[PDB]
């Protein structure tokens, strides 16, 4: 059936080439480019004493959770730089952290292969482990809450999982990646999510159906980062091959490539602005590069980190970008 | 600041105090990455020192060791090998009696050792090499020659010289002046590997301090 699979791939790529009526690069020639994004670090969040691997913004656009290898999960009041909580993780080898859209839970995980859910709002004043989601046989690289009771986690066991937090059970398993799955991105309607993995492919998953709707293969190296466009009809990846690609769900094709000659290091994190015209990618060359998502031009550079920028996020109100990094510092930019 | 903002700032300051205390207590730990290939004697030396990552805590002669057994991560190491970028030493386990086995076990061990020595995150990380099952290797070396694994040996067929050649093959993968490989031969029964790890870690710290001063 290998010949049938190869024929199906060939005819699918022929169908994709059929839809290539006009590249996104051509359409946006006659539109005004953003001049030059020059953002400035507004807050610097200090208190992580090791490498920060993940941060997530709260939906209130003021609280953010960060995960670092010092075994502490810190929730920051990014307006005042106050530390709302310092959550000591049972396993210090955290690789991902999520903040619930409600704000009542944070999740984290890593080399322990467990998604630990933390109840931020308990009757007692402590943040305690609400649930430990065991069942992944590889490290957890990403996790995102659907709501207070559902969280989707990607793993190094090449499979993503949808969890019922209350019962601690894998509601759905998202198999189909051949390499380590490195990132997740929920669509704004949370009816479907993309996941980029180490097979240099990003697969579009239906949360309810539990099956891969589409597979996107433009990258050459391991995809470390993925993020939907704000409207949910597109997403952008970030891989080790020093390029970001914008894939459209409906067009089922890569629309734009965000690469520059002097950039050779991999991309650890990608995110969009509120309008989505800016693609903010964090690179291993210690800085975050802002790209005009409609023209693939480096609008700006977020220099200011002294190590690999591992994580970055944009607030839901789009006011600020926070970039974590391996230098143990979180910086809010605006 | 408001009164509630004042109390929130005070709580944040207490949180920073606790984070500082924890980081101070954590910087005094010697972080060891236990690494190897399956049937190698990783479990034996862990049992001597005494999910997805197993962490072994043991204090030996006033020095605290955090030994990270990551053997349950059957995934791409390079996607998490950077989490151990700051370990004092990598404890690499090799089954000496793996030249005559296939899964070639010893060639796989050499390939893993090379990929770990020349990993970018481990350029200056020394390695406490353990040549395990030396009794089994001695039993198998008088019958099975060291030619199943190494065809270009062109040497004798005794236990000592064959094991020295194996250790030399492993040490030849270093290709760096700023790290050392502290090869030790273990028989899965001697209660000394803790002292060997301690001595190698002591030597690594001393050599690092000498390097800082320009004395190394």
């Amino acid at each position, epitope marked *: 059936l290998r010949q049938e699979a190869e024929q199906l791939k060939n005819q699918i790529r022929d169908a994709r080439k059929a839809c290539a009526d006009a590249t996104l690069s051509q359409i946006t020639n006659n539109i005004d480019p953003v001049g030059r994004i020059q953002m400035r670090t507004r807050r610097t969040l200090r208190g992580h004493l090791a490498k920060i691997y993940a941060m997530h913004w709260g939906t209130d656009s003021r609280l953010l959770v960060s995960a670092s290898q010092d075994g502490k999960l810190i929730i920051w009041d990014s307006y005042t730089t106050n530390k709302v909580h310092a959550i000591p993780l049972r396993s210090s080898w955290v690789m991902t952290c999520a903040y619930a859209p409600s704000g009542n839970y944070v999740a984290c995980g890593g080399l322990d292969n467990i998604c630990s859910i933390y109840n931020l709002k308990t009757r007692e*004043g402590n943040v305690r482990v609400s649930r430990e989601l065991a069942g992944h046989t590889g490290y957890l690289s990403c996790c995102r809450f659907l709501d207070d009771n559902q969280i989707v986690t990607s793993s190094g066991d090449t499979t993503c999982a949808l969890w019922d937090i209350e019962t601690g059970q894998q509601t759905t398993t998202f198999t189909g990646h051949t390499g380590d799955v490195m990132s997740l991105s929920l669509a704004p309607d949370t009816r479907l999510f993309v996941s980029g993995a180490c097979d240099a492919s990003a697969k579009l998953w239906d949360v309810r159906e539990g099956m891969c709707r589409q597979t996107f293969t433009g990258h050459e190296s391991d995809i470390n980062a993925i993020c939907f466009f704000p409207n949910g009809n597109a997403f952008a990846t970030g891989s080790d091959d020093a390029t970001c690609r914008l894939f459209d769900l409906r067009a089922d094709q890569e629309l734009m490539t965000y690469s520059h000659d002097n950039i050779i290091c991999g991309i650890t994190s990608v995110s969009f602005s509120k309008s989505g015209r800016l693609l903010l990618a964090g690179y291993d060359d210690f800085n975050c590069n802002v790209w005009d998502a409609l023209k693939a031009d480096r609008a700006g550079v977020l220099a200011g980190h002294d190590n690999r920028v591992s994580c970055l996020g944009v607030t839901d109100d789009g006011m600020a970008v926070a970039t974590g990094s391996w230098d143990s510092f979180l910086k809010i930019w605006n | 600041l*408001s009164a509630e903002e004042r*109390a929130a700032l*005070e709580r944040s300051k207490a949180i920073e105090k606790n984070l500082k205390e924890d980081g101070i207590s954590a910087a005094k730990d010697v972080k060891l990455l236990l690494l190897g290939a399956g049937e190698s004697g990783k479990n034996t030396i862990v049992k001597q020192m005494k999910t997805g990552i197993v962490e072994t805590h043991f204090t030996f002669k006033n020095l605290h060791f955090r030994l990270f057994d990551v053997g349950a991560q059957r995934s791409e190491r390079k996607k998490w090998i950077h989490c151990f970028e700051d370990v004092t030493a990598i404890i690499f386990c090799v089954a000496l009696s793996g030249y005559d086995q296939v899964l070639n076990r010893m060639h796989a061990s050499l390939k893993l050792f090379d990929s770990i020595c020349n990993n970018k995150f481990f350029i200056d990380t020394s390695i406490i090499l353990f040549l395990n099952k030396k009794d089994l290797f001695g039993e198998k070396i008088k019958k099975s020659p060291l030619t199943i694994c190494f065809p270009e040996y062109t040497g004798p067929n005794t236990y000592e010289d064959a094991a020295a050649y194996i250790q030399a093959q492993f040490e030849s993968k270093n290709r760096s002046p700023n790290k050392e490989i502290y090869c030790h031969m273990t028989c899965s029964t001697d209660t000394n590997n803790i002292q060997v790890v301690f001595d190698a870690v002591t030597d690594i710290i001393i050599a690092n301090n000498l390097r800082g001063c320009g004395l190394y």
Partner: single-chain antibody
Amino acid sequence: VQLVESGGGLVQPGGSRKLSCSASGFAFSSFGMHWVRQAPEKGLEWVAYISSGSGTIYYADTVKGRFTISRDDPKNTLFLQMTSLRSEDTAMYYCVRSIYYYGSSPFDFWGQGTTLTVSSSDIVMTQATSSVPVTPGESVSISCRSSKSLLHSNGNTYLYWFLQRPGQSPQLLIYRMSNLASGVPDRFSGSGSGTAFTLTISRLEAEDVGVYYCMQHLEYPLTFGAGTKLEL
């Protein structure tokens, strides 16, 4: 979550007495803890505040010097050392949980209190109405006014609403003006602005019958408005 105050009883005027509240079932060391007293027929009056970790301590000017608040975190006990107990120190003393981070809910839990009987620029919170008679199923609004604007430059208005039910400890209803407390049914609403505030009950039950108190948490000499007792 429990807070069991201990002490009280008859004390001769000018004497001394130690009030202890044994916290149970919560992370007592991470909570700022208060003493709030209430004279046998008067409203609530905040006595003292010891922060989490004993870092910051405040007293009411009517007890400052005579009173000393302390906490025993390993034993989860909050103390009030009272000296020179005047006749106006005759009140039920409630120990109050309070935790302060962004979005927290201070004053959420109150202890059962102890009756202490003494033998023979503060913001003025003035909820002027009192003894409001209401019927079940009706919607009642409870007014509150502040001498100074409780709204802070940060956007937060530090007005609290409590429910002294008959024979029961106060219970937080609305912690920061228009913020509904946990476990409080969403028939209470917080409204108002600046210096004037209103607490609305959409459809009051027999559970809602009690005395409703304002409290400001802007400047630390916390003050209450004399309770607007709701009666059937």
